[PDB]
Design a protein around this nucleic acid. Structure first.
Length: 196
DNA sequence: CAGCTCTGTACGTGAGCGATGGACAGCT
DNA sequence: AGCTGTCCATCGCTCAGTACAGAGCTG
């Protein structure tokens, strides 16, 4: 990566972009190599996140990884990952890393209390639900989940990973439905708050 | 048996690598 | 014309979680 070795990137971490009063917190798995390289969320060609954010209308213009720090103030969106350690792919992380991550994540969500905790990847919500709700399904679906983050009003919403690794949603177009339904959920929650 | 957990297998796009060679212009 | 090197179009190729079957486990 411009003369930077994989070994160097594996030591890097990606900072959280979290504030209070957010509508949405996008929760990824862990930083991939390009995210570690750039120091920004979801850069590069192997990820559909920024394209889906625009295609769904969650952003009115096409944004990129460099705009990520403007998302709390301008768009009401923040970022974190379940696991801090950078790896090329999510299958390089251990179960203990995921469960340590899950514990750290629930504390962050209980502190920041966004309207919606968005699990950018079904695999991480599978782990999270088992750890936090003590619930294992048989058969986990995408979209809105039936449990709130403990001691909060924060909802859980799951989308297929924005990574272009999965073949079941091969294009950014195949994932936009979930971003549109996330936008609708946010608007419904804002609509309820106005009506008390 | 019947639900489970765990493990290994199989799967589509499209952006952008290095490699290759065609178009083309400078020079003689 | 003959030669050459650069530019850049284009190539083939790689690769950035999910679903599910079946083995193993347990009530």
């Amino acid at each position: 990566f411009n003369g930077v070795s994989e070994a160097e990137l594996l030591t890097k971490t990606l900072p959280d972009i979290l504030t209070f009063n957010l509508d949405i917190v996008i929760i990824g798995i862990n930083p991939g190599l390009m995210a570690a390289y750039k120091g920004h969320h979801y850069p590069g060609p192997g990820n559909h996140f920024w394209k889906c954010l625009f295609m769904s209308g969650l952003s009115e213009v096409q944004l990129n990884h460099m705009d990520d720090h403007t998302l709390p103030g301008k768009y009401g969106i923040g970022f974190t990952n379940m696991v801090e350690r950078t790896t090329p792919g999510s299958k390089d992380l251990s179960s203990k890393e995921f469960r340590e991550g899950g514990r750290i994540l629930v504390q962050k969500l209980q502190k920041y209390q966004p309207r919606i905790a968005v699990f950018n990847g079904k695999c991480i919500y599978e782990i999270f639900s088992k750890e936090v709700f003590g619930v294992k399904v048989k058969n986990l679906e995408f979209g809105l989940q039936p449990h709130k983050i403990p001691d909060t009003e924060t909802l859980c919403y799951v989308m297929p990973s924005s990574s272009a690794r999965c073949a079941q949603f091969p294009r950014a177009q195949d994932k936009v439905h979930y971003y549109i339904k996330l936008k609708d959920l946010r608007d419904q929650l804002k609509g309820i708050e106005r009506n008390m």
